[PDB]
Amino acid sequence: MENFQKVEKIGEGTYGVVYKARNKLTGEVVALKKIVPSTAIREISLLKELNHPNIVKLLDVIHTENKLYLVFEFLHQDLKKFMDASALTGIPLPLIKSYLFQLLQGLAFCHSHRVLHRDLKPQNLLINTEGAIKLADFGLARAFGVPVRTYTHEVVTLWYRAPEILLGCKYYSTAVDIWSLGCIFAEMVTRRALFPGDSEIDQLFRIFRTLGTPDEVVWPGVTSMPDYKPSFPKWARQDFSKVVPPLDEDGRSLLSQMLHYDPNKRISAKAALAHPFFQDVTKPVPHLRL
Ligand SMILES: Clc1cccc(-c2cc(NCc3ccncc3)n3nccc3n2)c1Cl
């Protein structure tokens, strides 16, 4: 750590404080994250080779005095702040499309190596002045787990959590990240969180209120999941035209596939990249204020 000069505290992450820092050597500007069981060390070590343009680069791992620090490529802003800043007029559709397209490329790459994110949310989708967007903290969930509260006691959001996780599935798949991304896609379009749950049951019931209470027809096996209760109220499914106006038919079709209840039926990142919604995709340069 003596090799870094902390510039400023940028946030309180799930696992510890996050700082903008400078390498006292290469003068490099990086993000430094404070987080050790050998298993965690090995899992994180593997992430050093999981490199792709849409995945924030893991530069190094420092394990000293029995403390763990992760050094990442630095990006100036996150999607949460960009969305709040674009609340008045909303993010232009071409830019939402470009961001979704890029995030799907990031997921397709990691998923092809069987690595999941598991806790995708706007706060960990980072953007630069070139029109790129990247996934931060990929793979950390398997290495360290996803706690109920962060190190500073802040509630870890449930808003983007897949229903199979909420229903107690033990071995969820790469489909969980597609669900989260679909929730983020809808939020960029409407300028409001899709399912802003404030407890596990509120999260589930908000999902059911929009997509209908899942049953054996739409999700074979659902009634046998650990946290499924036959006493759940039965809500009817809303039309997507009501859920995400003014998204076009291509967008609504893709969203609806990203939010399928059955994880085995939910669209993959690779399939989503081939969807007609991306026919006219471009790479606009957003207006950033650093
Ligand atoms: Cl708290 C938290 C949670 C998840 C990811 C992050 C977080 C945020 C950024 N940059 C965005 C940013 C820059 C300056 N001030 C605020 C944000 N980065 N940049 C590389 C890793 C990283 N992780 C952070 Cl800070």
Say which of 60, 119, 198, 215 is annotated catalytic.
119
Whole-number Å distance, alpha carbon 176 to ligand 1 midpoint, is 22
Looking at residue 122, which CATH number applies to its domain? 1.10.510.10
Distance 33 CA to ligand 1 centre (A): 9
Kindly report the three-state secondary structure assignment for every residue of 126-160: EECCCCCEEECCCCHHHHHCCCCECCCCCECCCCC
Strands (E), 129-244: 133-135
Last residue of a domain, one of 29, 57, 76: 76
Claim to verify: residue 92 and residue 58 sit in the same structural domain? no
Tell whether ligand 1 has an atom less than 6 A from the beta carbon of residue 136: yes
11 lines ligand 1 (CB under 6 A): yes
- End position of a domain, from candidates 46, 76, 106: 76
* Spacing, Cα 169 to ligand 1 middle (Å): 30
Are residues 63 and 37 part of one domain? yes
* Structure's resolution in angstroms: 1.5
Same domain? 5 vs 146: no
Whether residues 36 and 143 fall in one domain: no
76 lines ligand 1 (CB under 6 A): yes
Pocket test for ligand 1, best of 12, 18, 152 (most atoms within 8 A of CB): 18
Q: Are residues 255 and 206 in the same domain?
A: yes
Residues in the chain: 290
Contact 9, 19 (CB under 8 A): yes
User: Which is nearest to 127 in space by CA: 188, 61, 59?
Assistant: 188
Q: Distance, CA 114 to ligand 1 centroid (Å)?
A: 25
Number of domains in the chain: 2
Instruction: Tell me how far apart the alpha carbons of residues 11 and 241 are, in angstroms, rounded to a whole number.
Output: 37
Cβ atoms 4, 22 nearer than 8 A: yes
Task: Assess whether 166 and 194 both reside in one domain.
Answer: yes
Q: Identify the helix (H) or strand (E) that includes residue 252.
A: helix 249-258
In this structure, which residue's CA is closest to atom 3 in ligand 1?
Answer: 13
Tell me the two tokens of residue 178. Answer: 């597609």
Looking at the fold, whether 256 and 192 belong to one and the same domain comes out as: yes
Query: E strand or H helix at 109, and its extent?
Result: helix 93-112
Distance separating alpha carbons of residues 197 and 195, to the nearest angstrom: 6
3-state secondary structure of 28: coil
The answer on 219 and 146 residing in a single domain is: yes
Residue of 75, 82, 74 lying closest to 128 (CA atoms)? 75
Sign of the four-CA dihedral 80, 85, 89, 92:
negative
Residues 106 and 186 in one domain: yes
Residues 46 and 169 in one domain: no
8 and 142, same domain (yes or no): no
**Whole domain around residue 137: which residue ranges?**
77-288
Helices 175-190, 249-258: crossing angle, 10 deg rounding: 140
My answer on whether 86 and 192 are in the same domain is yes
CATH number of the domain encompassing residue 55: 3.30.200.20
Which method was it determined by? X-ray
Provide the annotated binding site for ATP. 10-18, 33, 73-75, 78, 121-124, 137
The H or E element spanning position 73 is: strand 67-73
Strands (E), 13-94: 17-23, 29-34, 58-64, 67-73, 77-78
Nearest-angstrom CA–CA distance, 269 and 113: 13
Q: Of 31, 60, 76, which residue sits at a domain end?
A: 76
Cα separation, 206 vs 204, in Å, equals 5
Which H helix or E strand runs over 70?
strand 67-73
User: What φ, ψ does residue 126 adopt, rounded to 5°?
Assistant: -105, 145
Known catalytic membership, residue 119: yes
